[PDB]
Amino acid sequence: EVETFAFQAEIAQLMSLIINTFYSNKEIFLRELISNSSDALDKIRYESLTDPSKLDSGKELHINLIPNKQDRTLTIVDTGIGMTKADLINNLGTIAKSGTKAFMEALQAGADISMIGQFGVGFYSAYLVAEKVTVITKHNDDEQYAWESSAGGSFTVRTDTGEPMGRGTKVILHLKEDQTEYLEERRIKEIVKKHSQFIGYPITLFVEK
Ligand SMILES: Cc1cc(-c2ccc3c4c(cccc24)COC3)nc(N)n1
């Protein structure tokens, strides 16, 4: 059973600005997704101090980068706190706690897209390189869900079965045809070293089979 939702207007406008603005420095999407993973990892690490059973779904706190040239996908996996169904819909479909409004105003007052992370909307930079994004998430308090969007004002949410994660989030980027450089090992290594060298969790770049 697939549920379809409309993005809150300001979120649809933000995605459209990301998709339509001529902006060449697209590589920043990776540090923005890695930053979200690091924050989710900080949250599970903190909660598990006072409740060690929150780690029964997995003790390892890490980030995995999975390129796949055959599928034309780049996946960012973490074992962070994850999102419940309600967190998934609110965080991704609405302004929520974000600085969506300030970011859009900032862009008219001289800011540039690389500054997206200052406004709690870095996830949307995924749309600089991806035609479609699939988000698989498992929080300790809920079942596993798949969120999906190719923009155009809507997104879907369904339960996800058959490949259960213990806990965390998987951001699957179905890359645009001209954005395949982001599947190259030396390109990924270069971006991680340039923008994510200070992340306090291991970042493993998977090798293709
Ligand atoms: C628990 C969690 C949440 C997020 C996340 C995804 C997408 C959006 C987020 C926002 C705020 C906080 C976290 C996220 C707002 O923009 C979308 N990412 C990861 N990796 N993990």
Curated annotation (Swiss-Prot):
Residues recorded with modification N6-acetyllysine: 43, 69
Record: residues binding ATP: 36, 78, 97, 123
Region feature (Interaction with NR3C1): 1-209
Consequence of changing residue 82 to D: Abolishes ATPase activity
Post-translational modification: ISGylated. S-nitrosylated; negatively regulates the ATPase activity and the activation of eNOS by HSP90AA1.
Localisation per UniProt entry: Nucleus; Cytoplasm; Melanosome; Cell membrane
Protein role: Molecular chaperone that promotes the maturation, structural maintenance and proper regulation of specific target proteins involved for instance in cell cycle control and signal transduction. Undergoes a functional cycle that is linked to its ATPase activity which is essential for its chaperone activity. This cycle probably induces conformational changes in the client proteins, thereby causing their activation. Interacts dynamically with various co-chaperones that modulate its substrate recognition, ATPase cycle and chaperone function.
Domain notes: The TPR repeat-binding motif mediates interaction with TPR repeat-containing proteins like the co-chaperone STUB1.
Subunit organization: Homodimer. Identified in NR3C1/GCR steroid receptor-chaperone complexes formed at least by NR3C1, HSP90AA1 and a variety of proteins containing TPR repeats such as FKBP4, FKBP5, PPID, PPP5C or STIP1. Forms a complex containing HSP90AA1, TSC1 and TSC2; TSC1 is required to recruit TCS2 to the complex. The closed form interacts (via the middle domain and TPR repeat-binding motif) with co-chaperone TSC1 (via C-terminus). Interacts with TOM34. Interacts with TERT; the interaction, together with PTGES3, is required for correct assembly and stabilization of the TERT holoenzyme complex.
Similarity field: Belongs to the heat shock protein 90 family.
Protein name as it appears in the record: Heat shock protein HSP 90-alpha
Protein's gene: HSP90AA1
Shown stretch of the complete protein: 16 to 224 of 732
